[PDB]
């Protein structure tokens, strides 16, 4: 009665959801083949009257090479054979393809399986959609999926965990077009959008963790831990429980501004945790350190307008209050004038579980901090600069017009993001 359907769209979504569901299976009592070797699993797992637990997820991707590894490896037994939806071709780094031509004949199957998952749901809290902006099906089919999910279910909260394109590094060339065009649609069909950046996680893995040479799996494990901390209070008791609907009331001041950050504080290796006390006062300071955020935007250039803190483990409210006051009294961090409180707290008794083979340590303390700043506006400004630099000579538009799309879509999405861009200026002043 507190269930949360997960949707994973694209290669980034599938490779995040693999680590996510590994952590989910370890955290509850669910074996990799779906058996039991105490009702916390009901948020993520369903029940059959034979001892088998089925996840409440859909793995949707257009290329078959990413999902076929899921139905071959270890956790092939856990998932339903149909829940892994797979197309024939891909969107080929084209928002227009995955939104108009190839994604149209797949969306009916995904909608039908989402309906069949929701038929098992009686207390559906909301959705969790994982995708990436820089791809084709992670931008085209994700936008169409949320766009018809809003008409299918209405005001039900859909949370976004999107891989924003990095400022310095990039894996593609055409990604400013996709990232322009999907934020024109993830504005009216997304209640919240937690943004992450790849190179910031690279720097976090290099500095905080001992791991040089990190693959994508070490990147996905951190997102899995953060997204477990998001929904930890649903499955376990706590001193102060928070809900999914308790996030957006205290994190989203205006419906145009729903792009907060995420920060896992005690990111530390096993060797380094043996020497470091990880009390509340020492790990609350690591949340507000600009070098430890997972988006490459500096909050020193902006101002905080909200802060949501979710603690895990044996945290007394004594130290939480006494450390938030310490965060308040130092003037490196500054707040807007129109929020004088600027803090929301949550405490859950259940400590975060450890994955074996991961680079995280056994910790009795962990806080996941969600906060939206005005310092995310420089990311929109930079992506804007890249678009209007590339859109001057119309550098790649023939790969978009011929696949079911016009000329004026770029222009109207572009002035929409102009409105978004300097809607932040009227808020921070």
């Amino acid at each position: 009665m507190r269930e949360c359907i997960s949707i994973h769209v694209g290669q980034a979504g599938v490779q995040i959801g693999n680590a996510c569901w590994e952590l989910y299976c370890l955290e509850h009592g669910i074996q990799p083949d779906g058996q039991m070797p105490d009702d916390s699993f009901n948020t993520f797992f369903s029940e059959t009257g034979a001892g088998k637990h089925v996840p409440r997820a859909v793995f949707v991707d257009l290329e078959p090479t990413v999902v076929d590894e899921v139905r071959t490896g270890t956790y092939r037994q856990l998932f339903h054979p149909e829940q892994l939806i797979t197309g024939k071709e891909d969107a080929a780094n084209n928002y227009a393809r995955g939104h108009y031509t190839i994604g149209k004949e797949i969306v009916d199957l995904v909608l039908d399986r989402i309906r069949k998952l929701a038929d098992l749901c009686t207390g559906l809290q909301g959705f969790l959609i994982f995708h990436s902006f820089g791809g084709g099906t992670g931008s085209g089919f994700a936008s169409l999926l949320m766009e018809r999910l809003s008409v299918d279910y209405g005001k039900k909260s859909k949370l976004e965990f999107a891989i924003y394109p990095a400022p310095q590094v990039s894996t593609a060339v055409v990604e400013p077009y996709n990232s322009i065009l999907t934020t024109h649609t993830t504005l009216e069909h997304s209640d919240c959008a937690f943004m992450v950046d790849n190179e910031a996680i690279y720097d976090i893995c290099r500095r905080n963790l001992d791991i040089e040479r990190p693959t994508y799996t070490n990147l996905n494990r951190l997102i899995g831990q953060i997204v477990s901390s998001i929904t930890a209070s649903l499955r376990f008791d706590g001193a102060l429980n928070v809900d999914l609907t308790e996030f957006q009331t205290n994190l989203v001041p205006y419906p145009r501004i729903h792009f907060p950050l995420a920060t896992y504080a005690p990111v530390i290796s096993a060797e380094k945790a043996y020497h470091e006390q990880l009390s509340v006062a020492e790990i609350t300071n690591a949340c507000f350190e600009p070098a430890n955020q997972m988006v490459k935007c500096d909050p020193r250039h902006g101002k905080y307008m909200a802060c949501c803190m979710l603690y895990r483990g044996d945290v007394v409210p004594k130290d939480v209050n006494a450390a938030i006051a310490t965060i308040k009294t130092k003037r490196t961090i500054q707040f807007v004038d129109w929020c004088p409180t600027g803090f929301k707290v949550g405490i859950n008794y259940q400590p975060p579980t450890v994955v074996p083979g991961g680079d995280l340590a056994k910790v009795q303390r962990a806080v996941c901090m969600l906060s939206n700043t005005t310092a995310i506006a420089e990311a929109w400004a930079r992506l804007d600069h890249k678009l209007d630099l590339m859109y001057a000579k119309r550098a790649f538009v023939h790969w978009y017009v011929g696949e079911g799309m016009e000329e004026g879509e770029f222009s109207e999405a572009r002035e929409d993001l102009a409105a978004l861009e300097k809607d932040y200026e009227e808020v921070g002043v």
Binding site: R414, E415, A418, A419, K422
Partner: peptide, 18 residues
């Protein structure tokens, strides 16, 4: 519609200066 926001309710298309 000309270059700066005139008195009158309407959509703020900020790049077109309209």
């Amino acid at each position: 519609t000309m270059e700066k926001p005139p008195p009158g309710e309407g959509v703020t298309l900020w790049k077109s200066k309209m």
